[PDB]
Amino acid sequence: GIPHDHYEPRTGIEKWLHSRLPIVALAYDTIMIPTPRNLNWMWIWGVVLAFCLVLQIVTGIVLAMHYTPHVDLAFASVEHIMRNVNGGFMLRYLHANGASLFFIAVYLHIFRGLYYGSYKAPREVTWIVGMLIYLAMMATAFMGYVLPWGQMSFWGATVITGLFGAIPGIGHSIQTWLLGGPAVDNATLNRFFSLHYLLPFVIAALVAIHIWAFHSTGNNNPTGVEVRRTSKAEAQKDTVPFWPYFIIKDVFALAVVLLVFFAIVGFMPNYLGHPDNYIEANPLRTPAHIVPEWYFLPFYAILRAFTADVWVVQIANFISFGIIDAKFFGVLAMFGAILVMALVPWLDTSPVRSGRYRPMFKIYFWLLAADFVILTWVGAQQTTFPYDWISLIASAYWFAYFLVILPILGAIEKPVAPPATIEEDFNA
Amino acid sequence: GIPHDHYEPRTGIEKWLHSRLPIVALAYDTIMIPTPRNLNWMWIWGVVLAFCLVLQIVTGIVLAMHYTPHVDLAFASVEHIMRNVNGGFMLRYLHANGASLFFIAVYLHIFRGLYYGSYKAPREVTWIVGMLIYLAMMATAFMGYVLPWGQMSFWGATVITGLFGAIPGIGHSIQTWLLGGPAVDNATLNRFFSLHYLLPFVIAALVAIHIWAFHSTGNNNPTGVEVRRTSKAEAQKDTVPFWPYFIIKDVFALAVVLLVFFAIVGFMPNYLGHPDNYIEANPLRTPAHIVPEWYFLPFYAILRAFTADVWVVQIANFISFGIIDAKFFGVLAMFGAILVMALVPWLDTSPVRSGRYRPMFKIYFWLLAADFVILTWVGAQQTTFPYDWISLIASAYWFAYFLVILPILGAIEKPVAPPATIEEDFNA
Amino acid sequence: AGGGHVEDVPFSFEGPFGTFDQHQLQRGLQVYTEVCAACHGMKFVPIRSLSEPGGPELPEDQVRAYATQFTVTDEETGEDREGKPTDHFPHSALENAPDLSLMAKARAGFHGPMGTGISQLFNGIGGPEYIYSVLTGFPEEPPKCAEGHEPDGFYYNRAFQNGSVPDTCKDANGVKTTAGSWIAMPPPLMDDLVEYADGHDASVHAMAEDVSAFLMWAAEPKLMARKQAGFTAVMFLTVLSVLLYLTNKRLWAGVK
Amino acid sequence: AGGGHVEDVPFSFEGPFGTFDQHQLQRGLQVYTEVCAACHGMKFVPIRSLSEPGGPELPEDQVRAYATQFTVTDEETGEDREGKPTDHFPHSALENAPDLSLMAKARAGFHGPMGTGISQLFNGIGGPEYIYSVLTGFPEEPPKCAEGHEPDGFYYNRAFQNGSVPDTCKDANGVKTTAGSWIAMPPPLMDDLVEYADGHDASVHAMAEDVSAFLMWAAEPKLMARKQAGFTAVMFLTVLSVLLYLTNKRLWAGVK
Amino acid sequence: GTRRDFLYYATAGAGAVATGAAVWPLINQMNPSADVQALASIFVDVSSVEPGVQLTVKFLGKPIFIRRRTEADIELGRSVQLGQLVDTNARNANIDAGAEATDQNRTLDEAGEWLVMWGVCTHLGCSPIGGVSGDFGGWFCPCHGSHYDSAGRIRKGPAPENLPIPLAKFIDETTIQLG
Amino acid sequence: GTRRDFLYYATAGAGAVATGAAVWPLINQMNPSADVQALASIFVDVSSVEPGVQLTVKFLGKPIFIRRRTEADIELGRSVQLGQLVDTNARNANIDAGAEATDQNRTLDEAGEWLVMWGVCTHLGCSPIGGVSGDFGGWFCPCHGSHYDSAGRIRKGPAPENLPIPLAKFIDETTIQLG
Ligand code: HEM
């Protein structure tokens, strides 16, 4: 709710249109929103994500025109796309590596938010909608990965549908329902195709609410200091209109990102992937080096850290009369790691928005960042010593950060003082 | 537009939510819009259409979970859905007959508009968006019909992709592009599946703009007399809030419509269909009784009325140095019949909104209505005498109505006087 | 080609309350098995459905025994084996014999009047009647016009409308004079060509009516479920309609 | 199992400017045809691609002749018949011989270091090197630990990491001692097992390098197109980046 | 001056180019793929064909008609006068593109016994019904009412042309090679 | 009074019911279809199986292991004390649901040579690698690190149970009937 200037019908076509459907007015008020002048490069990832969503959707629709969702034809059909379809090879690689770009970008987008308190009031809804988008993105990418029907596809599907089989009582049922039968088979591939096509639109719809949400509150900036709302006058001292100032910075950033992205796709399209998915699904044999998609590794690491021998698991197994064994504990830990991140707005008790002015916070935050990288890295290692320990410590730190450290720092930290205005900070 | 009271946060959850994302406020201002008190049963079709769109989308997603878009498996897969899938038979029939309900409803929705001048200023945008929806609906239903891969499916696909082959110069290229090859084959079925899935979302997006559009101007009513905007006082004499007054008769109407619809689906699910589509596609043989889907008949009739022997065709063939033969003339006539309907806002020169107060208009309008029914009925007849003549006269009247009769009536008609207010009319 | 006349047989399954007659279906299955099956297949029909409710409803063991007669080529083995209830009936053994899985739906027996569709609206689409009529429509003597020009390998049939007709049987304009035309299917039936266990009559008339009911089931095995679902939906909606009507009436009362 | 050491062969196609060597591919195709093909198939490779640009690029007539050696089963006829360029190479004749269509991509030869992926980042995934190494890795004498316990029907291979290893060759913890393991594939090559037309050397080393390049092409027939598309995209974007930078620079100048 | 104006214009220009470069391939993936483009030629054994019989065969995904015409078929075909034909071009790939729609120009043999053509209506694609159907002793297209005579020439309806004749020729006594 | 309140109540009530009636089938279509539900039984010829060899066969879309154990396999299996196991239940459908995970309770025969079980990890579904793999001379699941001993009992990792044993019985000299 920043004070600024609203749209004015000039042309005749404009006035005619405006008295019937104020769509040009809305576009204008959206493209002309006053944005803090001090945003830095870490504010470009939202645009990279919007682009990725569009990229994934158009290349997806196209791939779906040549793809056959049937166990006897799925893999052959992806090879037909690669060898026969005009530009098929490039479209396939763009969709595949696009998934990676999509995640590299959300993780940077997410951590940017964790650091500057972009989730703090009044931005909780923006944050929650974003969390929903994140869950959808994961479900979408998982189903997409199953479509090729390669080895990683089949076993990854077996394992992920297995997660639901771990829920006590109703579990076996939910798993049978997701599979459409006793095992991962054609009925499974068929429904995953339909859902892989549907979810991206749900995401698009959520992204719409996401944009509306941050537009309602105005963007946060690196200082955590809001834009002055008292008068157009000072508000302008703090901002510049989104168009063309930021629209251009964003498009420029996007071009640089796409430069690297296309270099990857053109020169090392298979680097971020798993060689075993170039082997046809074999229901009678699991590859020795099965490993999840990199953007899934950290959560995967948390899950397998919890074996029957872990003390907290043993305590849990005892105290719950066995309902909660390691299997279910690992599943809870994994979904729980995502859930605590969703709750951060209510776990961070500090009233200081930007972590730029929080000396103790900066330490735990960077430990969290390093922890994420460590988790990702251990996920690709074996379960033997010392990886088993590293994964436990990394998982421990993750839950510690959200459930213990953040609520404590709130009452214990001595925050440095922030500028009194964005203007102030900008000139500096 | 119309004076109304606004939303006000009451609960705590409400005020918390409202200061972050005014979504509940928007829903309220939408559900509470003041609506003319005099709307009649012809204002229920928009809701029937919204329901149909949702019905088609959910049953579609579900069907896509068991359907295989491949020539060797497509038909077998629809039979598998019919025989094996729990409730498959009912879901299939609901999707199929849902297409018919969808069209029965748009034609009533469209004619309602043609009669009450709901397309007249300031409602031109509402009308144009609606026309776009209509084009999408037809392309969507056409592609869906091809999915089963039955006889009607294959030949209907051959013919409709053939339409584009009729465009001079670029035509053969566009047709090869749509087909993905020299004939209707797997590449064709495969891309139709993807596009059949995609279009409904485009329609949903357009419907959103459609709703926004008529919300911007306010609904039209049977008298063509706008709601008084001068004061909340009189505005209320003319209206009642959409919720719960209209929401309830709409839901009531919908229940009656669905009653008939389910009776059809339960007792005569194959009545509105073609028996030949229960025969597998045979690329070497066109059924003797091939006939389009009923909701396509009228436009089909217009198209085949124009043979080489029609005088207007021969004139055109002469005057265009043979570029416009019967083949292309029929295609232009057919798309043209749709285009003139889209232009009606600029062809109807009368300043009187509702045709209730247009004595001469009433006559031509009902002739148009009867003409539509006649065209539909002739489409299912042979090309022999006298059907060939009937189709020509019916087609002639169709273009006459929009291109001649409406522009003339504008200057020639002596319009009866309409009530001074909706309230006046309502009490009567 | 065109459309023609079909004997209007009253089948138990017609009407909103119609239902299949389990014994007729069973008899029909015997006719199909003993006669039709020699040329016609039912490739979309899983044998095991002979067990499901709403159809012949044969005991699983009988069905399992039955499936044994077909010799199927296993999908991985490639080697042949006996048939299993999980297998579909086979494809047509005779290249030009159409598949009968969906015949009762792939045909209309009631047309018009005047291409208005009012006939079907009250009589149904007419597929089983059509099938009956074809089985029932082979007369011993061909119509005179053709007497000396019967195409070889063909047989005159009163109901069949898509066959060829001798030149000597087309009017001044080329339109056929005969009620039917020539079909490549030789008369398949003949009184008591099938011995029904319970001694039910096996007159060409009876068998044709039974196998027709059977083929209707083979095409719409969920006919009964569909109709049950229909009544249900109609009842909910009839109730809900009345309630919404009253609610609507009460709500507006405070205005008009 | 695990990951191992692969001889780092410098293939012409590696590097952003790498491209296939048409003659090598041709030689490789001969090796595949004369040796490998006896057990391994290439089910996803259409024979006609032997003609397309960016590969062996053989004249259509040769390809047409070549396809003749294959005795395919017609999709209609069902009866057998000679091969057409429109056919795919056949499936593996030897049940346990894996399909080679995608092998150069379904194996990595460079791993780590420390599971960091930095090795591949600079060396590639290593599929062709891996294949080379396996063909090249059959030593005459088995490593000592196994001397008397070689599984029957298997052969020791330096590069193969997923094979079985004699108990006598695993350490205190069960981890194998040998660099490689036992593979069910008997050594395929042998100096000059193939007579190259142009008299090129047919040393096990040469053939292995050629057939490896060939298999890389069979897996990524669009390698060159992909890289050309890459440069293109990079050029556009490099230009567009600079322009957007200047535009960005000029636009903000009027503020800070 | 036009230093900054040129930049903004060169920029938007590069954009447009990149955009098009992305759009073209999204369009072109729908064009025939390499497996389809492998347009073969086929051989048809025609030894079991008596006169009055039409053989329907698939080629390039479309039907091809091979009728061994009767005397009546040939008589009626030769009886028509060029200027009475809706389309006077022979539409025969085996001869000159300018050839005329004379019956002799529509068959493979001089006796005009072998009529070989695409059973693809020139209106919108359906396959016309043979067995001497229609108002001209030829074929009748049920899709929109086109009638073709015994030489496959269009005589009525919306079809603009005569059924095309593909490259075809007897490769021997009883074998025709299409394409 | 509650005349109109009851109506509005009964109305919304009918709605909810109709709604649910529509929703259930949208959910249930995803449950196993009739072709899937036709869960058969299969026969496995086991005459070519020497000891130390595992046969992997598909059943209900999942792998089933048939190992003819060696003496070493049998000794090591019999040497484990019930109280040393992670899961003490036999998970054998061929015997009492309460049976104990003794090696004798894990084989089909008294001699304990025939180990027949679902090659489906009880953690999240992967098929464990055999050939005497892992820290207990049995199978090793590469998905999350579960180890099973030579009787297919879980000894380490996140898997909560022993590999299940399906209805299985030698139908004769060299044939086992699963299911
Ligand atoms: C021809 C020179 C030839 C090549 C090339 C080749 C390659 C090859 C590879 C790369 C593998 C896969 C190894 C892996 O899993 O990483 C492989 C495997 C097998 N081969 Fe082979 N092979 C060539 C030739 C032959 C010939 C002539 C035979 C049959 C005598 C043969 C057989 C096999 C078998 C069996 C395997 C399976 C290996 C295993 O998993 O134990 N090969 N080959």
Ligand code: HEM
């Ligand atoms: C939310 C954006 C999307 C993401 C994150 C995504 C992700 C993926 C992933 C990870 C794969 C596997 C790639 C591979 O390794 O082969 C895939 C495959 C596929 N996706 Fe998507 N996808 C998205 C949107 C879409 C849409 C909208 C469609 C359908 C219109 C679609 C259709 C396909 C198809 C057909 C495949 C199979 C072909 C292939 O394997 O490349 N995708 N997708």
Ligand code: HEM
């Ligand atoms: C494709 C999915 C996503 C898209 C398209 C998207 C897009 C955007 C955009 C355009 C912005 C504004 C520009 C910016 O600050 O970067 C933004 C801001 C934000 N996003 Fe996202 N985002 C996505 C996912 C997420 C996720 C997963 C989260 C965290 C769970 C998230 C949290 C936020 C937050 C907190 C802000 C700050 C808003 C503010 O400053 O007021 N977003 N997002």
Ligand code: HEM
């Ligand atoms: C997806 C199909 C469509 C849906 C869901 C839809 C829905 C609606 C709804 C809910 C209304 C308001 C209530 C009513 O008058 O019934 C409406 C009004 C209207 N619709 Fe549609 N419509 C559709 C298609 C069309 C088409 C094809 C046209 C004409 C080409 C059209 C023209 C109009 C017009 C002119 C109005 C009246 C606007 C006014 O009163 O101000 N609609 N539509």
Ligand code: HEM
């Ligand atoms: C815009 C609303 C839609 C319309 C008008 C429509 C129309 C149709 C029609 C006419 C058919 C053929 C029915 C038959 O006679 O068997 C069909 C089939 C199909 N539609 Fe849609 N459809 C719609 C939306 C969707 C959506 C959103 C999906 C989701 C993928 C979908 C999936 C399918 C599938 C899989 C089939 C083939 C199986 C069948 O024949 O029932 N449709 N559709």
Ligand SMILES: C/C=C(C)/C=C/C=C/[C@H](OC)[C@@H](C)[C@@H](OC)[C@@H](C)CCc1oc2c(O)c(OC)cc(OC)c2c(=O)c1C
């Ligand atoms: C219709 C069915 C639906 C919609 C199911 C949706 C599930 C959605 C979840 O997202 C919300 C889920 C994907 C998400 O859990 C939060 C991931 C981080 C799970 C991480 C994951 O990946 C693996 C993987 O990729 C593999 O590949 C071969 C293999 C795996 O074991 C070897 C794993 C694995 O062990 C885990 C935990």
Ligand SMILES: C/C=C(C)/C=C/C=C/[C@H](OC)[C@@H](C)[C@@H](OC)[C@@H](C)CCc1oc2c(O)c(OC)cc(OC)c2c(=O)c1C
């Ligand atoms: C990739 C997407 C594509 C190619 C979309 C194309 C959309 C095209 C148009 O939608 C806007 C088109 C459906 C619409 O023309 C306005 C209809 C009225 C066409 C009417 C139509 O139906 C036929 C039909 O259904 C048939 O069935 C067996 C057979 C047909 O000949 C016998 C016809 C036919 O002769 C005509 C004119």
Ligand SMILES: CCCCCCCCO[C@@H]1[C@@H](O)[C@H](O)[C@@H](CO)O[C@H]1O
């Ligand atoms: C409220 C609208 C109710 C419409 C009821 C229509 C009853 C249709 O009843 C039909 C018969 O007419 C038809 O002959 C047989 C064929 O098997 O199938 C029945 O379901």
Ligand code: FES
């Ligand atoms: S396609 Fe033959 S008359 Fe139209």
Ligand code: FES
């Ligand atoms: S599925 Fe076996 S260890 Fe997890």
Ligand SMILES: [Sr+2]
């Ligand atoms: Sr004339």
Ligand SMILES: [Sr+2]
């Ligand atoms: Sr009857």
Ligand SMILES: [Sr+2]
């Ligand atoms: Sr190298």
